[PDB]
Each structure stands twice: as C-alpha cells, then as structure tokens.
Design an enzyme around this catalytic site. Structure first.
Site, PDB file in Angstrom:
ATOM      1  N   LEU A 116       0.821  -1.210   0.000  1.00 32.47           N
ATOM      2  CA  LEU A 116       0.000   0.000   0.000  1.00 32.47           C
ATOM      3  C   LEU A 116       0.864   1.274   0.000  1.00 32.47           C
ATOM      4  O   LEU A 116       0.426   2.337  -0.446  1.00 32.47           O
ATOM      5  CB  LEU A 116      -0.991   0.003   1.175  1.00 32.47           C
ATOM      6  CG  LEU A 116      -1.898  -1.236   1.365  1.00 32.47           C
ATOM      7  CD1 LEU A 116      -2.634  -1.146   2.678  1.00 32.47           C
ATOM      8  CD2 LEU A 116      -2.897  -1.406   0.205  1.00 32.47           C
ATOM      9  N   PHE A 142      13.112   2.232   4.485  1.00 38.14           N
ATOM     10  CA  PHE A 142      13.289   1.223   5.540  1.00 38.14           C
ATOM     11  C   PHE A 142      12.046   0.480   5.970  1.00 38.14           C
ATOM     12  O   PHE A 142      12.131  -0.425   6.781  1.00 38.14           O
ATOM     13  CB  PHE A 142      13.958   1.874   6.768  1.00 38.14           C
ATOM     14  CG  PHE A 142      15.286   2.542   6.479  1.00 38.14           C
ATOM     15  CD1 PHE A 142      16.404   1.797   6.173  1.00 38.14           C
ATOM     16  CD2 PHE A 142      15.408   3.914   6.516  1.00 38.14           C
ATOM     17  CE1 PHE A 142      17.615   2.417   5.916  1.00 38.14           C
ATOM     18  CE2 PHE A 142      16.624   4.528   6.261  1.00 38.14           C
ATOM     19  CZ  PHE A 142      17.716   3.783   5.960  1.00 38.14           C
ATOM     20  N   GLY A 143      10.909   0.854   5.435  1.00 39.06           N
ATOM     21  CA  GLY A 143       9.658   0.201   5.805  1.00 39.06           C
ATOM     22  C   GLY A 143       8.565   0.203   4.756  1.00 39.06           C
ATOM     23  O   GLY A 143       8.665   0.880   3.732  1.00 39.06           O
ATOM     24  N   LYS A 144       7.520  -0.576   5.010  1.00 40.11           N
ATOM     25  CA  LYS A 144       6.381  -0.676   4.106  1.00 40.11           C
ATOM     26  C   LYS A 144       5.092  -0.981   4.846  1.00 40.11           C
ATOM     27  O   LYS A 144       5.122  -1.490   5.969  1.00 40.11           O
ATOM     28  CB  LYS A 144       6.631  -1.709   2.987  1.00 40.11           C
ATOM     29  CG  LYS A 144       7.067  -3.103   3.462  1.00 40.11           C
ATOM     30  CD  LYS A 144       7.217  -4.079   2.286  1.00 40.11           C
ATOM     31  CE  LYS A 144       7.525  -5.492   2.707  1.00 40.11           C
ATOM     32  NZ  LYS A 144       7.024  -6.496   1.715  1.00 40.11           N
ATOM     33  N   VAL A 145       3.960  -0.640   4.226  1.00 39.90           N
ATOM     34  CA  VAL A 145       2.625  -0.993   4.689  1.00 39.90           C
ATOM     35  C   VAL A 145       2.088  -1.897   3.594  1.00 39.90           C
ATOM     36  O   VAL A 145       2.092  -1.525   2.422  1.00 39.90           O
ATOM     37  CB  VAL A 145       1.712   0.205   4.949  1.00 39.90           C
ATOM     38  CG1 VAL A 145       0.270  -0.237   5.131  1.00 39.90           C
ATOM     39  CG2 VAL A 145       2.176   0.981   6.159  1.00 39.90           C
ATOM     40  N   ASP A 175       0.139   7.325  10.509  1.00 41.75           N
ATOM     41  CA  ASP A 175       1.508   7.811  10.415  1.00 41.75           C
ATOM     42  C   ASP A 175       2.315   6.806   9.638  1.00 41.75           C
ATOM     43  O   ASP A 175       2.765   5.814  10.206  1.00 41.75           O
ATOM     44  CB  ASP A 175       2.111   8.111  11.807  1.00 41.75           C
ATOM     45  CG  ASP A 175       3.420   8.914  11.811  1.00 41.75           C
ATOM     46  OD1 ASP A 175       3.830   9.413  10.729  1.00 41.75           O
ATOM     47  OD2 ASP A 175       4.013   9.070  12.891  1.00 41.75           O
ATOM     48  N   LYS A 203       2.152  -2.916   8.880  1.00 44.10           N
ATOM     49  CA  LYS A 203       3.339  -2.071   8.787  1.00 44.10           C
ATOM     50  C   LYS A 203       4.473  -2.918   9.269  1.00 44.10           C
ATOM     51  O   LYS A 203       4.323  -3.623  10.263  1.00 44.10           O
ATOM     52  CB  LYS A 203       3.225  -0.782   9.623  1.00 44.10           C
ATOM     53  CG  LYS A 203       4.346   0.214   9.321  1.00 44.10           C
ATOM     54  CD  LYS A 203       4.205   1.507  10.079  1.00 44.10           C
ATOM     55  CE  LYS A 203       5.400   2.395   9.870  1.00 44.10           C
ATOM     56  NZ  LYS A 203       5.159   3.764  10.393  1.00 44.10           N
ATOM     57  N   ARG A 250      -1.869  13.481   3.609  1.00 40.48           N
ATOM     58  CA  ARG A 250      -1.206  12.212   3.288  1.00 40.48           C
ATOM     59  C   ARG A 250      -1.148  11.235   4.464  1.00 40.48           C
ATOM     60  O   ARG A 250      -0.850  10.057   4.239  1.00 40.48           O
ATOM     61  CB  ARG A 250       0.226  12.477   2.785  1.00 40.48           C
ATOM     62  CG  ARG A 250       1.134  13.083   3.852  1.00 40.48           C
ATOM     63  CD  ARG A 250       2.513  13.388   3.333  1.00 40.48           C
ATOM     64  NE  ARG A 250       3.233  14.199   4.301  1.00 40.48           N
ATOM     65  CZ  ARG A 250       3.319  15.513   4.235  1.00 40.48           C
ATOM     66  NH1 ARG A 250       2.741  16.172   3.237  1.00 40.48           N
ATOM     67  NH2 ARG A 250       3.949  16.187   5.182  1.00 40.48           N
ATOM     68  N   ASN A 251      -1.350  11.733   5.717  1.00 41.20           N
ATOM     69  CA  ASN A 251      -1.318  10.947   6.960  1.00 41.20           C
ATOM     70  C   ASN A 251      -2.696  10.847   7.574  1.00 41.20           C
ATOM     71  O   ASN A 251      -2.831  10.730   8.787  1.00 41.20           O
ATOM     72  CB  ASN A 251      -0.277  11.496   7.948  1.00 41.20           C
ATOM     73  CG  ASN A 251       1.126  11.044   7.665  1.00 41.20           C
ATOM     74  OD1 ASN A 251       1.397   9.898   7.265  1.00 41.20           O
ATOM     75  ND2 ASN A 251       2.068  11.918   7.907  1.00 41.20           N
ATOM     76  N   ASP A 302       3.778  15.090  12.064  1.00 42.75           N
ATOM     77  CA  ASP A 302       3.640  15.031  10.608  1.00 42.75           C
ATOM     78  C   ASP A 302       2.164  14.996  10.199  1.00 42.75           C
ATOM     79  O   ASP A 302       1.762  14.172   9.373  1.00 42.75           O
ATOM     80  CB  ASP A 302       4.432  13.852  10.020  1.00 42.75           C
ATOM     81  CG  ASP A 302       4.770  13.939   8.545  1.00 42.75           C
ATOM     82  OD1 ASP A 302       4.241  14.852   7.861  1.00 42.75           O
ATOM     83  OD2 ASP A 302       5.550  13.090   8.071  1.00 42.75           O
TER      84      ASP A 302
HETATM   85  C1  LIG Z   1      -6.390   1.373   0.739  1.00 47.24           C
HETATM   86  O1  LIG Z   1      -5.124   1.951   1.017  1.00 47.24           O
HETATM   87  C2  LIG Z   1      -4.641   1.890   2.295  1.00 47.24           C
HETATM   88  C3  LIG Z   1      -3.377   2.463   2.451  1.00 47.24           C
HETATM   89  C4  LIG Z   1      -2.777   2.481   3.676  1.00 47.24           C
HETATM   90  C5  LIG Z   1      -3.433   1.923   4.811  1.00 47.24           C
HETATM   91  C6  LIG Z   1      -2.967   2.072   6.153  1.00 47.24           C
HETATM   92  O2  LIG Z   1      -1.649   2.545   6.242  1.00 47.24           O
HETATM   93  C7  LIG Z   1      -1.034   2.643   7.487  1.00 47.24           C
HETATM   94  C8  LIG Z   1      -0.517   3.830   7.979  1.00 47.24           C
HETATM   95  N1  LIG Z   1       0.146   3.904   9.141  1.00 47.24           N
HETATM   96  C9  LIG Z   1       0.285   2.790   9.882  1.00 47.24           C
HETATM   97  C10 LIG Z   1       0.875   3.003  11.259  1.00 47.24           C
HETATM   98  C11 LIG Z   1       0.192   4.157  11.969  1.00 47.24           C
HETATM   99  O3  LIG Z   1      -0.876   4.593  11.565  1.00 47.24           O
HETATM  100  N2  LIG Z   1       0.851   4.704  13.020  1.00 47.24           N
HETATM  101  C12 LIG Z   1       0.370   5.688  13.930  1.00 47.24           C
HETATM  102  C13 LIG Z   1      -0.974   6.078  13.954  1.00 47.24           C
HETATM  103  C14 LIG Z   1      -1.476   6.872  14.984  1.00 47.24           C
HETATM  104  C15 LIG Z   1      -2.926   7.266  15.021  1.00 47.24           C
HETATM  105  C16 LIG Z   1      -0.597   7.312  15.964  1.00 47.24           C
HETATM  106  C17 LIG Z   1       0.762   7.029  15.906  1.00 47.24           C
HETATM  107  C18 LIG Z   1       1.730   7.841  16.733  1.00 47.24           C
HETATM  108  N3  LIG Z   1       2.528   8.761  15.910  1.00 47.24           N
HETATM  109  C19 LIG Z   1       3.720   9.191  16.623  1.00 47.24           C
HETATM  110  C20 LIG Z   1       1.748   9.930  15.508  1.00 47.24           C
HETATM  111  C21 LIG Z   1       1.228   6.177  14.909  1.00 47.24           C
HETATM  112  C22 LIG Z   1      -0.192   1.549   9.439  1.00 47.24           C
HETATM  113  O4  LIG Z   1       0.040   0.465  10.246  1.00 47.24           O
HETATM  114  C23 LIG Z   1      -0.293  -0.823   9.733  1.00 47.24           C
HETATM  115  C24 LIG Z   1      -0.859   1.482   8.225  1.00 47.24           C
HETATM  116  C25 LIG Z   1      -3.772   1.727   7.214  1.00 47.24           C
HETATM  117  C26 LIG Z   1      -5.032   1.218   6.937  1.00 47.24           C
HETATM  118  N4  LIG Z   1      -5.529   1.025   5.724  1.00 47.24           N
HETATM  119  C27 LIG Z   1      -4.744   1.389   4.653  1.00 47.24           C
HETATM  120  C28 LIG Z   1      -5.329   1.356   3.363  1.00 47.24           C
END
Ligand SMILES: COc1ccc2c(Oc3cnc(CC(=O)Nc4cc(C)cc(CN(C)C)c4)c(OC)c3)ccnc2c1
Length: 306
Positions: free
Chosen positions: A30, A35-38, A185, A58, A171-172, A167
């Site tokens: 996705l 260094f990483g991927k989802v 994130d 992730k 995009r986040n 961040d």
């Molecule tokens: C259809 O396309 C898609 C495309 C991408 C997808 C998707 O990508 C991700 C994005 N990020 C992360 C990690 C993450 O969110 N970390 C994080 C989140 C919060 C609330 C707080 C903190 C603390 N920090 C310091 C702020 C960290 C993922 O982990 C598996 C997946 C998630 C779900 N569905 C997806 C569908």
C-alpha cells in the site's frame, strides 16, 4: 528524544495483541519507504468465527537498521497505549516473536485522503448534490467540513493522551467507509527521499511547508506545533489536494517570509470561517493558537449552522 511528552520505551506492550504471523497472508504493498512498508494482508482467525479479514500490516524492510527497529517497536507501544478511537487508525494486533515486528491495523478501503481529494477534485460539487446523481459519490463541501471536524476530533484525542504527531498532513489521514477519516503515520513506509513535500533541512528530510516556525528553527514539537500543521492540512483540504505555498520553493526566501509573517491566502473552496481557523493555527505566538478542543467546538457550530 524523538517523542516530546511521553516515553514509549517506558510504555508497556500487552501480549493480548500478539497474533500468529503464519495466520497472515500478504498481498500488495500500500506504501513503501527506504526502511519500511505498509502491505495489505488477509488475517485468518482474527474474528471469533473462522472468517478471514483484510488488514494493513506495517513492517520494516531488510534495508532497516537498529534505530528503525527500535522506532517500529516504540510505534507499536504507542498504538497499544492509545487504544480505540473512531478518528485514529485502530490496532488489531502485532507479531513480536517469530521474526521481524509486524504492526497490524484496520484496513481503510479508500486509502490516504490526499490522493482521494486529488481523484475527486475534478468532480467536486460546492453546493448540494442532485438526488439522481447521488450514486456518483460526488465530493461536496459538506464532506470537507466533516473531514475537517473528524481530524480535529482525532487530534484532540491524541493531544489528551500527550501524543504529538509531528507530521499532520492530508497524506497521513486515511479514509474509510461512511466518509470516516482516520489519522495515521506512514513514517518509514513513505519514500520521503523522493516525496517533494519533504525537504532537506540539515541532515533530515522534513515536511517544512507543514511545520511551525518554532519546529523549523528550534526542532521543538508541541501540541501548538501540531495545531499549525492542522491549519496547513485545512488548506490542503479546501484546495482539494493542492500543495501548500504553491510556486514557492523551500529556500532562504521561504524561511524569511514565514518568520516575517507571510501566510497563505484562503483556498478556493474554504468557507470564510474555516480560513479564520487556519489564520489562528498559523499565529506566530504558539500561545495565541487554538487548542484542538477549541477547533472542535468551532467546527461543530459551523456544521449545525448549515
Ligand atoms: C487502501 O489503502 C490503504 C493504504 C494504507 C493503509 C494504512 O496505512 C497505514 C498507515 N500507518 C500505519 C501506522 C500508523 O498509523 N501509526 C500511527 C498512527 C497513529 C494514530 C498514531 C501514531 C503515533 N505517531 C507518533 C503519531 C502512529 C499503518 O500500520 C499498519 C498502516 C492503514 C489502513 N488502511 C490502509 C489502506
């Protein structure tokens, strides 16, 4: 520290999250960084019944070093710590033993908001949608306000848990079913070296156009610095995915202008009252910026009035 208020290493990790990695069938990527991927995956046995389920995983790449390995673990401890909230991407489980650490969250079917806005830009309807053409799933101003409210709600939550995003951008933010936004994130799962929204500031690749002056000039990240970023997010939102400060490169003149008080004008679709939020988020004085809870109350009233 790479965390301002909370220390994730001192945070615990509940083994209630522990999921067997053999029960994960991987699909398409996705998003990926250096260094990483989802990756999209199908998790078996995550539901009480034998039923399979789509999740987002992730993880790190073999390209990753010890500092990234430690980062992914601290990220896991923080997601475990925050727990359930509607406007935050929710953790479903994790794999710590049996190999590399895997962070399993819910799958948000519409992906990141930035790309969503961009693909919906040309079919955006400022006014009310016709009952016949409702099937076409047109983006309206009503959706933009709903997204601006949900992101403030989510950020208000994060802030109450002493978490700083560092961040906050379109995009986040992920979009799921029922026009529901979920703050995420990507971090290491984003190719920041090739993303033009990140800029070389010293030895780092930082999203300068979303950063508060204090974050740029002092590397200090507060609740108030996240409010600034939110104000930039609001601009991206009501510009229907435009890049902030259009035509302005991140040069000496850019830094000078922000320091001097230059601020973006209102995007084409931003209600006057939303621009008012953006101007306060961009106050040079962090103490003069609203709190996310203030922002929530502000948007809530704007919504009722319509
Ligand atoms: C259809 O396309 C898609 C495309 C991408 C997808 C998707 O990508 C991700 C994005 N990020 C992360 C990690 C993450 O969110 N970390 C994080 C989140 C919060 C609330 C707080 C903190 C603390 N920090 C310091 C702020 C960290 C993922 O982990 C598996 C997946 C998630 C779900 N569905 C997806 C569908």
């Amino acid at each position: 520290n790479n965390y301002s208020y909370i220390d994730p290493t001192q945070l615990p990790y509940d083994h209630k999250w522990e999921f067997p990695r053999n029960r994960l069938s991987f699909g398409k990527t996705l998003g990926a960084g250096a260094f990483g991927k989802v990756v999209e995956a199908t998790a078996q046995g995550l539901i009480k019944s034998d039923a399979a389920m789509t999740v987002a995983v992730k993880m790190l790449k073999p390209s990753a070093h010890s500092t990234e390995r430690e980062a992914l673990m601290s990220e896991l401890k923080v997601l475990s710590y925050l727990g359930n909230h509607e406007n935050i991407v929710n953790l479903l489980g994790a794999c710590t033993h049996g190999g590399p650490t895997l962070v399993i969250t819910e799958y948000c079917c519409y992906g990141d908001l930035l790309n969503f806005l961009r693909r919906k830009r040309d079919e955006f309807v400022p006014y009310k949608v016709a009952p016949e053409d409702l099937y076409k799933d047109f983006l309206t101003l009503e959706h933009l306000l709903s997204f601006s409210y949900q992101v403030a709600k989510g950020m208000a939550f994060l802030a109450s848990k002493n978490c700083i995003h560092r961040d906050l951008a379109a995009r986040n933010i992920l979009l799921t079913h029922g026009n529901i936004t979920k703050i995420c994130d990507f971090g290491l799962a984003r190719d920041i070296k090739n993303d033009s929204n990140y800029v070389d500031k010293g030895n780092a690749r930082l999203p300068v156009k979303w950063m508060a002056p204090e974050s740029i000039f002092n590397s200090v990240y507060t609740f108030e610095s996240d409010v600034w970023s939110y104000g930039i997010f609001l601009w991206e939102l009501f510009s229907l995915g435009s890049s902030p400060y259009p035509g302005m490169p991140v040069d000496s003149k850019f830094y000078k202008m922000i320091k001097e008080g230059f601020r973006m004008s209102s995007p084409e679709y931003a209600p006057a009252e939303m621009y008012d939020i953006m101007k306060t988020c961009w106050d040079a004085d962090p103490d003069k910026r609203p709190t996310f809870k203030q922002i929530v109350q502000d948007i809530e009233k704007q919504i009722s009035e319509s």
